[model samples]
Each structure stands twice: as C-alpha cells, then as structure tokens.
Target: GSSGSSGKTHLCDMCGKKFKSKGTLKSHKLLHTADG
Candidate 1:
C-alpha cells in the first residue's frame, strides 16, 4: 500500500528496479548505458 495517485511504477529492464516516474527510470537507465 503506497501513496501518490499517479500510482504508476516504471520498471527498468537493465536492472529490474522500480521507479515512481518514467523520467526517473530513463535517467537511471543512462547509468547502465554509460557503464556499458
């Protein structure tokens, strides 16, 4: 049970991590890309 009406969780394919916003996830994915 979490708060926030957006209620949307973004999944990261590279790390399998859940983010509250797609934008955040996109930034996170960049880390993987930069590393690779």
Candidate 2:
C-alpha cells in the first residue's frame, strides 16, 4: 500500500480536528488563539 498522505490527515492538538495541510492547520490555530 501507498503512504496515506491524502486529504485532511493532519490532526490539530488544540481542537482535535483534521486539516488538509499544514497551511490550513496554521490558519485554524488562529481560531483557538483568537478566543484565548
């Protein structure tokens, strides 16, 4: 089998949600940062 690197495989530590890429993850972090 191939390495599964497709789709939102990355998980966020702050919200425990999956993101498509590191770029989106960085953007998503803002949500947590803005609230705190």
Candidate 3:
C-alpha cells in the first residue's frame, strides 16, 4: 500500500519552490543562504 493524498501539498508562495512535504520544503529553503 502507499500513502494517500488526503490533503494538499505545500509550497513557497514567494518563490514557487515545490516539495512533496512541508518538512522537505523547509529544509530546501536553507539552501538559499548567502554562501549557498
């Protein structure tokens, strides 16, 4: 069996970044550091 899409996905409204889950998106945002 697989997970069900019972709810909507999350994204960064300001950047249009995408992710399968909010946790993943939050981590991805860290890459926007000045040194990145």
Candidate 4:
C-alpha cells in the first residue's frame, strides 16, 4: 500500500516493484505467472 496510488504512468500493481518503464514491467509480470 506504500509508495502507490500516485497515478504514475509506469506504476505497477505488484507493490514495491513499481516501475519507471514498461520494459521492466514486462518481465516483472512473469513473476505473477508462477501462480498461473
């Protein structure tokens, strides 16, 4: 819940794993695949 809801363009929903670019967000999404 911390460091979020700032309406960032690259903000990620993975918590502490916020982003500055979509490039990293792509790989970061893979982390969620583990549950799939």
Candidate 5:
C-alpha cells in the first residue's frame, strides 16, 4: 500500500471535466461510443 492514498481523487480522461469522484460515469461511457 505504499504511495497509495484513498478517497476522492480522479480525473476525466474523456473531457478533462473531473469525475463524479460515483453514480455518473455509468452513462458517461455512452457519450464516447468507441467500444475500443
């Protein structure tokens, strides 16, 4: 667990808009539609 911290730290790789940080990224994938 070295260099590992918990709680509320994430970034939006798609739009650089920041994350839910839950409950939002669920549908957030639909916007991309890449399926890659």
Candidate 6:
C-alpha cells in the first residue's frame, strides 16, 4: 500500500483526511461520497 508506516496522524494532506488508525482511514476513503 502507498501509505507508509508513518503513524496514524500522518494523513492524505491533499484531502485533509485525518486518520487516528489506518483502518479508520480506509473507512474514510470508502465513505467519501461527496465531490472532492
């Protein structure tokens, strides 16, 4: 996966998506239903 083991706070800075855990991040990506 492109996401390195840089800890949870590290996020997709381009989209401002914060992830306290990688699993949550994955869920965020899945739940992104709005236009970016």
Q: Pick the candidate with the highest lDDT.
A: 1
**TM-score winner among the candidates?**
1
Q: Which order, best to worst by TM-score?
A: 1, 2, 3, 6, 4, 5
* Total clashing pairs in model 5: 0
Write model 6 residue lDDT over 1-36, tens digit each, in one string. Answer: 476555448475458777788787777776655566
- Regions of candidate 6 where Cα sits further than 4 Å from its true position: 1-10, 33-36
Sort by lDDT, best first. 1, 2, 3, 4, 6, 5
C-alpha lDDT of residue 20 in model 2: 80
After superposition, the stretches of candidate 4 with alpha carbons farther than 4 Å from their true spots are 1-7, 14-16, 34-36
Worst 10 residues of 6 by lDDT: 5-14
Model 4 lDDT per residue over 1-36, tens place? 476465676656666576778988877887776653
Q: What is the C-alpha lDDT of each candidate?
A: 0.81, 0.78, 0.71, 0.70, 0.59, 0.67
Please give the lDDT score for candidate 2.
0.78
Residue 34 of model 6, lDDT score = 50
Which lDDT value does model 3 have at 35? 57
Give the CA lDDT, 0 to 100, for residue 13 in model 3.
Answer: 67
Clashing pairs in 4: none
Superposed Cα RMSD, model 6: 6.8
Q: Estimate each model's TM-score.
A: 0.64, 0.60, 0.47, 0.45, 0.35, 0.45
Model 1 per-residue lDDT tens digits across residues 1-36: 456444567989777799988899998988888752
Residues 1-36, candidate 5: write the lDDT tens digits.
Answer: 478645663555677554653446646656867577
Lowest lDDT 10-residue stretch of candidate 2:
1-10
Residue 27 displacement (Å), model 3? 0.9
